[PDB]
Structure formats: structure tokens, C-alpha cells
Amino acid sequence: KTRIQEYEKELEKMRNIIPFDQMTIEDLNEVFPETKLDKKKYPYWPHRPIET
Amino acid sequence: YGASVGEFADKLNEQKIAQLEEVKQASIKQIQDA
């Protein structure tokens, strides 16, 4: 039941977000931490590896 | 060529939002499945 509760929490948190047409890189930074270009390994531009 | 230059911007932006929105539409059903 606790896992279920966490899963709903995630579900509504994911369902309730602004249309992308107004969103910003920051929005995807918070909602999806997977888009954060870790400066702890890639400081210099483009952060994302050049070999990709 | 100036009259056929918004198509590249379309492919740059519409698909950029398309991959995000398909990820969202899949993620909602993924949480549903869980």
C-alpha cells in the first residue's frame, strides 16, 4: 500500500504539468532530472559529450 | 528558396516537442501499468 501511494503521488505529479509550448529547459530540469547535463563531469560546452 | 525555409524549423521544433510528448504519453501508461 505504501508503494501504491508513492506510485499515485508520482502519477499525478507527472500528469499535472504545463503544455510544452510555454515550458523551458528549467521545467525539464526539475520535472525530469535526466535532462540535467551534469557539470560534475562535463563543464565546458556542450556538456553533452561531443561524441553523441 | 525563402518560401520553403520554415519546414526545417518545423522539423527542429515540432519533433523536439513530439519526442517529449510521446515520452509523457508512454510514461503515464507506464505508471498505470505499475
Do A20 and B21 form a contact (C-beta atoms < 8 A)?
Answer: yes
Question: Cβ contacts (< 8 Å) between B24 and chain A: which residues?
Answer: 14
- The resolution in angstroms reads 3.2
Task: Quickly list DSSP for B1-34.
Answer: -GGG-HHHHHHHHHHHHHHHHHHHHHHHHHHHH-
Contact call for residues B34 and A4 (beta carbons, < 8 A):
no
Under DSSP, is residue A28 helix (H, G, I), strand (E, B) or coil? helix
Contacts of A7 in chain B (CB under 8 A): 31, 34
Q: How was this structure determined?
A: cryo-EM
CA-based nearest distance B31→chain A, Å: 6
Cα within 13 Å of Cα(B10), Cβ side:
4
Residue recorded with cell 502519477: A11
Of A19, A17, A27, A15, the closest CA to residue B28 belongs to A15
* Integer Cα distance of A9 and A12 in angstroms: 6
**Residue A1, SS3?**
coil
Lookup: cell for A16: 499535472
Give the span between the Cα atoms of A8 and A14, in whole angstroms.
Answer: 10
Could you tell me which of B13, B12, B8, B34 has the C-alpha nearest to residue A5? B34
